[PDB]
Amino acid sequence: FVNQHLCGSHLVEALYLVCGERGFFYTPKTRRYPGDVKRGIVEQCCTSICSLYQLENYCN
């Protein structure tokens, strides 16, 4: 039984496994340019373990 922070390659793998259905758009705030080597969502789980309930909210 292990529980690493949802980040890096594991985070993307976790999103597809947690969302299950393949019809979710996963559209975030975008903030004009959604790049510039930054995300915010990853940092939140990188520093602390994110709860399953919050991941479900992002997967609308």
CSV table of N, CA and C in Angstrom, one decimal:
chain,number,residue,atom,x,y,z
A,1,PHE,N,0.9,-1.2,0.0
A,1,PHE,CA,0.0,0.0,0.0
A,1,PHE,C,0.9,1.3,0.0
A,2,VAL,N,0.8,2.0,-1.1
A,2,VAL,CA,1.6,3.3,-1.2
A,2,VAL,C,0.8,4.5,-1.5
A,3,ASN,N,1.3,5.7,-1.3
A,3,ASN,CA,0.5,6.9,-1.7
A,3,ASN,C,1.4,8.0,-2.0
A,4,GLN,N,1.9,8.1,-3.2
A,4,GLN,CA,2.8,9.2,-3.6
A,4,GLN,C,2.0,10.4,-4.0
A,5,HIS,N,2.7,11.6,-4.1
A,5,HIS,CA,2.0,12.8,-4.5
A,5,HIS,C,1.6,12.7,-6.0
A,6,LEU,N,0.4,13.1,-6.3
A,6,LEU,CA,-0.1,13.1,-7.7
A,6,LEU,C,0.6,14.1,-8.5
A,7,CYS,N,1.7,13.8,-9.1
A,7,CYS,CA,2.5,14.8,-9.9
A,7,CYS,C,3.3,14.1,-11.0
A,8,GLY,N,4.0,14.8,-11.8
A,8,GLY,CA,4.9,14.2,-12.9
A,8,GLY,C,4.1,13.3,-13.8
A,9,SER,N,4.6,12.1,-14.1
A,9,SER,CA,3.9,11.2,-15.0
A,9,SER,C,2.8,10.5,-14.3
A,10,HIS,N,2.9,10.3,-13.0
A,10,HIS,CA,1.9,9.6,-12.2
A,10,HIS,C,0.6,10.4,-12.2
A,11,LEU,N,0.6,11.7,-12.1
A,11,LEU,CA,-0.6,12.5,-12.1
A,11,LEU,C,-1.5,12.3,-13.3
A,12,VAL,N,-0.9,12.3,-14.5
A,12,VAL,CA,-1.7,12.1,-15.7
A,12,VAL,C,-2.3,10.7,-15.7
A,13,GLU,N,-1.5,9.7,-15.3
A,13,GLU,CA,-2.0,8.3,-15.2
A,13,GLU,C,-3.1,8.3,-14.2
A,14,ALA,N,-3.0,9.0,-13.1
A,14,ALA,CA,-4.0,9.0,-12.1
A,14,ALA,C,-5.3,9.7,-12.6
A,15,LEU,N,-5.2,10.7,-13.4
A,15,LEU,CA,-6.4,11.4,-13.9
A,15,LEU,C,-7.2,10.5,-14.8
A,16,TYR,N,-6.6,9.8,-15.7
A,16,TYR,CA,-7.4,8.9,-16.6
A,16,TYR,C,-8.0,7.7,-15.8
A,17,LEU,N,-7.3,7.2,-14.8
A,17,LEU,CA,-7.8,6.1,-13.9
A,17,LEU,C,-8.9,6.6,-13.0
A,18,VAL,N,-8.7,7.8,-12.5
A,18,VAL,CA,-9.8,8.3,-11.5
A,18,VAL,C,-11.0,8.8,-12.3
A,19,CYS,N,-10.9,9.4,-13.4
A,19,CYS,CA,-12.1,9.9,-14.2
A,19,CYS,C,-12.9,8.7,-14.7
A,20,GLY,N,-12.2,7.7,-15.1
A,20,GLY,CA,-12.9,6.5,-15.7
A,20,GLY,C,-13.5,6.8,-17.1
A,21,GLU,N,-14.6,7.5,-17.1
A,21,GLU,CA,-15.3,7.9,-18.4
A,21,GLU,C,-14.3,8.7,-19.3
A,22,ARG,N,-14.4,8.5,-20.6
A,22,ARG,CA,-13.5,9.2,-21.5
A,22,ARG,C,-14.2,10.4,-22.2
A,23,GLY,N,-15.3,10.9,-21.6
A,23,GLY,CA,-16.0,12.0,-22.2
A,23,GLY,C,-15.8,13.3,-21.4
A,24,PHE,N,-15.0,13.3,-20.4
A,24,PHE,CA,-14.8,14.6,-19.6
A,24,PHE,C,-13.8,15.5,-20.4
A,25,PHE,N,-14.2,16.8,-20.5
A,25,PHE,CA,-13.4,17.8,-21.2
A,25,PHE,C,-12.1,18.2,-20.4
A,26,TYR,N,-12.2,18.2,-19.1
A,26,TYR,CA,-11.0,18.6,-18.3
A,26,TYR,C,-10.6,20.0,-18.6
A,27,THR,N,-11.5,20.9,-18.8
A,27,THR,CA,-11.2,22.3,-19.2
A,27,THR,C,-10.9,23.2,-17.9
A,28,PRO,N,-9.7,23.6,-17.7
A,28,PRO,CA,-9.4,24.4,-16.5
A,28,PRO,C,-9.6,25.9,-16.7
A,29,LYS,N,-9.0,26.7,-15.8
A,29,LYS,CA,-9.2,28.2,-16.0
A,29,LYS,C,-8.4,28.7,-17.2
A,30,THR,N,-7.4,28.0,-17.7
A,30,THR,CA,-6.6,28.4,-18.9
A,30,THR,C,-5.8,29.7,-18.6
A,31,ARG,N,-6.3,30.7,-18.1
A,31,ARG,CA,-5.6,32.0,-17.8
A,31,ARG,C,-4.8,32.4,-19.0
A,32,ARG,N,-5.5,32.8,-20.1
A,32,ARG,CA,-4.8,33.3,-21.3
A,32,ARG,C,-3.8,32.2,-21.8
A,33,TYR,N,-2.6,32.2,-21.6
A,33,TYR,CA,-1.6,31.2,-22.1
A,33,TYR,C,-1.5,30.1,-21.0
A,34,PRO,N,-2.0,28.9,-21.3
A,34,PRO,CA,-2.0,27.8,-20.4
A,34,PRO,C,-0.6,27.0,-20.5
A,35,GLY,N,0.5,27.7,-20.4
A,35,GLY,CA,1.8,27.1,-20.5
A,35,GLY,C,2.8,27.8,-19.6
A,36,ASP,N,3.8,28.4,-20.1
A,36,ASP,CA,4.8,29.2,-19.3
A,36,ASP,C,5.3,28.3,-18.2
A,37,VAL,N,5.6,27.1,-18.5
A,37,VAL,CA,6.2,26.2,-17.4
A,37,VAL,C,5.5,26.3,-16.0
A,38,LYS,N,4.2,26.2,-16.0
A,38,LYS,CA,3.5,26.4,-14.7
A,38,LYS,C,2.1,25.7,-14.8
A,39,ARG,N,1.5,25.4,-13.7
A,39,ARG,CA,0.1,24.8,-13.7
A,39,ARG,C,-0.7,25.2,-12.5
A,40,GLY,N,-0.1,25.0,-11.3
A,40,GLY,CA,-0.8,25.3,-10.0
A,40,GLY,C,-1.5,24.1,-9.5
A,41,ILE,N,-2.2,23.4,-10.3
A,41,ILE,CA,-2.9,22.1,-9.9
A,41,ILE,C,-1.9,21.1,-9.4
A,42,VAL,N,-0.8,21.0,-10.2
A,42,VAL,CA,0.2,20.0,-9.9
A,42,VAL,C,1.0,20.4,-8.6
A,43,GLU,N,1.2,21.7,-8.5
A,43,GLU,CA,1.9,22.2,-7.2
A,43,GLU,C,1.1,21.8,-6.0
A,44,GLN,N,-0.2,22.0,-6.1
A,44,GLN,CA,-1.1,21.7,-4.9
A,44,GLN,C,-0.9,20.2,-4.4
A,45,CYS,N,-0.8,19.3,-5.4
A,45,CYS,CA,-0.7,17.9,-5.0
A,45,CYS,C,0.8,17.6,-4.8
A,46,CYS,N,1.7,18.2,-5.5
A,46,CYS,CA,3.2,18.0,-5.3
A,46,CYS,C,3.6,18.3,-3.9
A,47,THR,N,3.2,19.4,-3.3
A,47,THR,CA,3.6,19.7,-1.9
A,47,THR,C,2.8,18.9,-0.9
A,48,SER,N,1.5,18.6,-1.2
A,48,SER,CA,0.7,17.8,-0.2
A,48,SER,C,-0.1,16.8,-0.9
A,49,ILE,N,-0.5,15.7,-0.3
A,49,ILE,CA,-1.4,14.7,-0.9
A,49,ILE,C,-2.8,15.2,-1.2
A,50,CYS,N,-3.2,15.2,-2.4
A,50,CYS,CA,-4.6,15.7,-2.7
A,50,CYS,C,-5.7,14.7,-2.3
A,51,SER,N,-6.8,15.1,-1.9
A,51,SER,CA,-7.9,14.2,-1.6
A,51,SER,C,-8.6,13.7,-2.8
A,52,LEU,N,-9.2,12.6,-2.8
A,52,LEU,CA,-10.0,12.0,-3.9
A,52,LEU,C,-11.1,13.0,-4.3
A,53,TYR,N,-11.8,13.6,-3.3
A,53,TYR,CA,-12.9,14.5,-3.6
A,53,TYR,C,-12.5,15.7,-4.5
A,54,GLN,N,-11.4,16.2,-4.2
A,54,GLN,CA,-10.9,17.4,-5.0
A,54,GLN,C,-10.6,16.9,-6.5
A,55,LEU,N,-10.1,15.8,-6.7
A,55,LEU,CA,-9.8,15.3,-8.0
A,55,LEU,C,-11.1,15.2,-8.8
A,56,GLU,N,-12.1,14.6,-8.2
A,56,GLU,CA,-13.4,14.5,-8.8
A,56,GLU,C,-14.0,15.8,-9.3
A,57,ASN,N,-13.8,16.9,-8.5
A,57,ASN,CA,-14.3,18.2,-8.9
A,57,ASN,C,-13.6,18.7,-10.2
A,58,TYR,N,-12.3,18.5,-10.3
A,58,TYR,CA,-11.6,18.9,-11.5
A,58,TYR,C,-12.1,18.1,-12.7
A,59,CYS,N,-12.5,16.8,-12.5
A,59,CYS,CA,-13.0,16.0,-13.6
A,59,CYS,C,-14.5,16.2,-13.7
A,60,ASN,N,-14.9,17.4,-14.1
A,60,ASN,CA,-16.4,17.6,-14.3
A,60,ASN,C,-16.9,16.9,-15.5
